[PDB]
Design a protein around this ligand. Structure first.
Ligand SMILES: [Ca+2]
Lengths: 393, 393, 393
């Protein structure tokens, strides 16, 4: 029934979701198309999904779709974490950006989020104020924590005064460093107040990206060369998992140091199945369906043992994200392909019949590579070999 | 019994052999060590082997080893193609090379070859005058065809006079181009006389090397990108086989144009299982145990259907060949590892029990990768993708 | 009008032609589509075209199209050089190539070429036996000159016997080196006989390609750096023209040395307007519409002053030639784009109204870049700067 009951409870697995099927978000998916996705995710035991803005129709249409499916079937159950997108002044225009001022359009985006939580209170269990909106590298739109605090407080006040349910949880979904787990430049009074104001912290961590941008944890190191190729991948991927755990834990340590006790949940993490830039064959050798599956399963095990939700990125490949370059890793974060093929990670579920009778865009849910593990393994590369310096410890 | 009976007869499979186990040929293998190898090869249906010089003790010791095994077991059968190494003047010294004069040491090398054919006429069926000794790129030692002709004619004269068996076959083992199948620069009078003088032509062809030095045949081309990874390798490797066939056939065409009918046999070809230079991960993606197996089997099928012997390169990895770089492809041409592990190509024979009871240096004959095909496939890379131009044919 | 009247006569400008509009030749253009092209070329003063094979329907359909247009308009005039494609044994199969034997399919290709010259003797003025079929780098299909000679002689015998007009000219269209103007490896008896058997020599020369493969002529050298950009391009492009002239003249010198007098015509040369490989921004800086125009005009001036035809490559961009890579230079040799836009070279003619009322695939003949020379010039790069050594002459 409530966010407190759902989050951290492995009977309600979370996922990040977008239902766009073409190279532009101008092509909005229809309610019928979104219902296809909902049925597929529901069959997999996904019970809560996450969304990014309320400016385009997409989020509103997902709620309509879920409502229709709940009317068709009284046992159908899907919940939503609704994202209200937050911008700095002049974001997405040709005018000079100001990261110390807010977009005049944040107010109406918060208003539209509120309206949706009110029309669909049986589905909407969380509002997230911003998506990576405080991280200092989000050059196109980032804001100061004072702006997120402002809107989180606005939402907490609407709950106090009775315009929103007292059980509706408010958060902001952001990088670990924005929540205080990294550079101490972020450790400002406004962040402390924000950590007080939210009901929980939605934290993002991305080892896959750091296989390029901070690669110290990524490789085959020393004696590992003498191990089996299978074992080398297992060990390397385990380091990737532990790296994420460290970043999450760093946020927990920060909040403990402020004398604040709040739940932490993973709002975003993922590992793409293909890259023609930094993360694939021409760079760090991270991206393929096998390593994606390993990462997904490690993240599930960790989060279910720690009682954290993980809104894993992402349900379906979304080819609008790097529109002019289809091989870009942004287009390959799905557990399924755009056409509804199940990647290695979900082959086991296809075999058990979990998606029987279900369709995406006319296609049945088929295994990628025709379920041929050997054909996948030929395409998989090993992580790069590195040498380790021994410290005199 | 005779070379004419053995060559081109698939009941007598050929191989190129060296028994050195260390990074220098100064460490001669013992007779006991060589017997280990002979037993292994014999178990595999190898019945004739090839050797490169008679200067070091190695070839003489192999003959001693085979003799001991034939005394122990009346059904043991192994034959030898003995290589007499030919040099140009000042080869392997610090004096100026002269490729139009011969080394003074050739004479005694030919004498030693003759002495061995005489002491072991039941084993030695062929003498080869030179190994790639005419090919113009063998900068360290190459000679003109007049010098090979000279020694071939010397050996044919010893046969005529009765000092050697009339059934002993004489050849020279050389690159396809040296035998007239390539640049017409080679098409000189002395080569025509050499082709007349030999009993047969021992021809080398190396697609693996040409994956770097002449790569037009090597890759995944056009529409092939849409095929399965398994199929892509099969197609690419088939082009490699066909390339070798074309080079061998080019020699057959050249001798036919001279009005000469001689048998042709493959004296050398091979595909290494590892390379840290041009042929592996840092270059053409040719070298691994899977592609080696594909090449070996294709060469066996082709040669057995064409009634050619193939002295396939090579039985065992020999780590002295690129002594200062163990990852060099020269050290990885074996069907077995230096420690006696059977590479992918022979896994099937290990499972049938062909090598049971047999040992190399104390080790039983084990499968590489623990016989785990998946582990191998992770290490295998695909050939590079290439541009296909369509001609208006 | 006879081949003798047409070739070398600037009242009958020549061009290489294909009418394919899609990325595969499986999509044959219709007779209606081909008529569109013929009208466009005719408006430009093109009076003879060249074709590459008579296996696919394309060449036959061009003849049908020209015939229809001659029936519609008694002043319409278009002639054809018909290419009979010649292959070596196993070309375009997965079997081993043999460049010393011929394809079993050559005979019927020659038969189909003779049938077309017979059904359309008012249009077909030349048969060309082969297209680059002797050049030793055409690895996929090349043949020995004996094979071309065989079929040229066959055709000359059909003319003698009266099955073909005595005024029909026979040739082979090939690289300057194949005709004896380069490596003397080509200087064999069968070539001399071929030079005697043909009515003329159709010679190909490609400076554009040599800006990568033999770049000694290509660049901005020494003092030229101080010159205007406009002038640096003019000087460099003049060297490209003179390079082609030298290659053509080298063929003329070779036939003179044999005491043979035959006309020489340029069967193929061209300069692509775009390249994403060796010839554009990522390599030699050759390819753009400005340098193409300069080359085209230089080749026209040279050929018209020397009384040579130039079957310039090519009328329209043909995107099937490098099907899997649309930025490949093979797809950009047109004077027009696939959509019927006139590249820089023909802007002047669009302005004079030469193509008024004419259409390709529904589109009028428009200028590329909207006829904005400045917009073109921004995209054009200068040739690379090179080291000039002064000799002591
Ligand atoms: Ca030469």
């Amino acid at each position: 029934v409530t966010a407190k009951d759902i989050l951290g409870n492995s009977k309600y697995l979370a996922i990040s979701y977008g239902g766009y099927r073409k190279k532009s978000r101008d092509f909005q998916p229809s309610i019928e198309e979104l219902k296809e996705d909902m049925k597929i995710l529901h069959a997999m035991n996904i019970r809560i999904l996450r969304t990014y803005n309320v400016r385009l129709a997409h989020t509103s249409n997902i709620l309509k779709a879920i409502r229709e499916l709940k009317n068709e079937d009284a046992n159908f159950e899907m919940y939503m974490m609704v994202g209200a997108w937050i911008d700095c002044k002049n974001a997405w225009t040709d005018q000079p950006l100001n990261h110390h001022e807010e977009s005049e359009n944040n107010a109406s985006e918060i208003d539209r989020a509120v309206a949706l939580a009110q029309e669909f209170p049986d589905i909407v269990k969380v509002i997230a104020v911003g998506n990576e909106a405080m991280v200092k590298w989000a050059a196109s739109y980032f804001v100061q924590p004072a702006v997120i605090l402002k809107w989180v407080n606005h939402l907490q006040a609407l709950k106090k005064k009775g315009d929103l349910s007292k059980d509706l949880w408010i958060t902001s979904s952001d990088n670990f460093a924005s929540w205080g787990g990294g550079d101490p430049q972020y450790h400002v009074e406004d962040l402390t107040k924000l950590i007080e104001a939210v009901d929980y912290l939605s934290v993002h961590t991305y080892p896959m990206h750091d296989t390029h941008y901070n690669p110290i944890f990524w490789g085959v190191f020393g004696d590992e060369t003498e191990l089996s190729s299978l074992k080398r991948i297992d060990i390397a991927m385990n380091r990737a998992k532990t790296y994420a755990v460290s970043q999450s834990d760093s946020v927990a340590s920060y909040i403990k140091s402020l004398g604040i006790n709040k739940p932490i949940h993973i709002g975003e993490t993922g590992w793409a199945s293909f890259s023609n830039g930094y993360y694939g064959a021409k760079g760090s050798k991270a991206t393929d369906e096998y390593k994606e599956a390993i990462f997904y399963n490690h993240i599930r095990e960790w989060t279910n043992e720690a009682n954290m939700s993980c809104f894993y990125f992402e349900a379906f490949d979304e080819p609008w994200k790097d529109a002019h370059n289809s091989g870009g890793s942004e287009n390959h974060f799905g557990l399924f392909t755009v056409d509804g093929k199940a990647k290695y990670v979900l082959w086991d579920l296809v075999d058990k019949g979990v998606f029987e009778g279900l369709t995406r865009g006319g296609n049945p849910i088929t295994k990628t590579y025709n379920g041929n593990k050997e054909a996948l393994f030929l395409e998989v590369e090993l992580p790069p070999v590195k040498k380790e310096i021994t410290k005199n410890h």
